[PDB]
Design a protein around this ligand. Sequence first.
Ligand SMILES: O=c1[nH]nc(Cl)c2ccccc12
Ligand SMILES: [Zn+2]
Length: 209
Amino acid sequence: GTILIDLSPDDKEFQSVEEEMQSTVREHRDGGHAGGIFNRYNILKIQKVCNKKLWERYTHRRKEVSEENHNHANERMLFHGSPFVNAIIHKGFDERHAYIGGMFGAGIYFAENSSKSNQYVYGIGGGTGCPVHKDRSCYICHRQLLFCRVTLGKSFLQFSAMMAHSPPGHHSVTGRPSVNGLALAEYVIYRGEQAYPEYLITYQIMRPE
Ligand SMILES: O=c1[nH]nc(Cl)c2ccccc12
Ligand SMILES: [Zn+2]
């Protein structure tokens, strides 16, 4: 079902996706423990993920949510890092991609900061790092992130001091850091059909000069 189309680095689509990656790196409170130490990426490949059944499943949900929310899907593009990226692009998001222990209950988490999603590429809190070197700051091994279409609908705003259900009458949760003024929002959805893994980004973190 799924096919991957490579974007040309010469294509403005590839460049705006790269731009969204690079411009949303920030420093993290763990000093790089989970995702490694870096200020920018070496982007290796960007692919468009194409799956007609998964897309129809997404837009069918999007229209439902839209209809329930002052005609507004509230659709965003957000990063998602996960060791199960191969399964997500083939079979879609589901409960086995839910972060049981997350701050906003058991759902599927996305971030505005690419560097926040990079923390999850090798597992929760970076797991034990790359499979080859066991290094959470590995500069050699190739990482992948998804840059996804996410339907938020009516989003419950939850300020944070940094499968379950949406709070009644809402279709997601906005987790908004209230202490770190440079940290962008995270978002949690509770139905796999509310996200589509539109781009697959293959990259390395770069060692700071
Ligand atoms: O990109 C992400 N992937 N996985 C998780 Cl649990 C997560 C949790 C918070 C913020 C971002 C992410
Ligand atoms: Zn490695």
